């Protein structure tokens with residue numbers, strides 16, 4: 001059975017304070033081999049990778065964000081919170097051949113180029129199939145793994161799997177191992193995810209995100225909203 005990754009459900013801070021968020025593994029201590037990543041969700045479904053590899057901050061992220069290990073947990077510290085830091089923060093831990101996302105922490109702050117291009121939506125019938133696309137622009141598609149993530153209300157982020165665009169090699173989560181089909185087309189720098197026999201259980205926003213070994217989920221697509229409805 002897959003590990004459960006636990007985050008505080010909600011924390012409150014105020015402008016100028018230092019605040020720390022944590023990410024616990026059900027299997028034992030979080031270590032550097034879990035390559036802890038931190039991703040920020042801002043309104044309008046805007047995701048940005050902040051930290052990966054435990055403590056490696058992504059380019060362009062404000063320096064007040066830092067990652068460490070504390071108390072057998074991964075920890076994100078915001079040193080001097082700003083009003084715009086009010087957001088949901090997800091961690092992700094690597095377990096040898098899959099990522100697991102934590103449930104997210106809603107941070108309230110009281111008092112306040114590279115593109116991954118995804119179509120906005122798919123409206124499909126129950127029982128139908130769909131092929132979701134994610135076109136990479138502004139970087140070398142074959143140099144990064146392409147990950148896919150599902151977001152449903154009350155269910156956080158859920159890692160589906162990833163593809164190596166150089167080989168088409170895939171790794172899936174247990175939940176998606178017999179469900180998602182990932183492919184790429186190299187000449188058009190596009191990644192695809194196919195599903196069949198869809199139901200309302202599949203209605204969600206699906207994101208692609210790039211990753212480089214030891215680094216971070218820096219850039220995310222805007223998400224395709226899949227609505228499975230008669």
Ligand SMILES: O=C(O)CNC(=O)Cc1ccc(O)c([N+](=O)[O-])c1
Nearest residue numbers: 035094145162171211212213214215
């Ligand atoms: O091996 C290194 O140098 C650093 N390791 C990592 O970054 C973790 C890792 C390994 C393999 C893999 O397929 C993915 N992935 O994201 O799917 C992530």
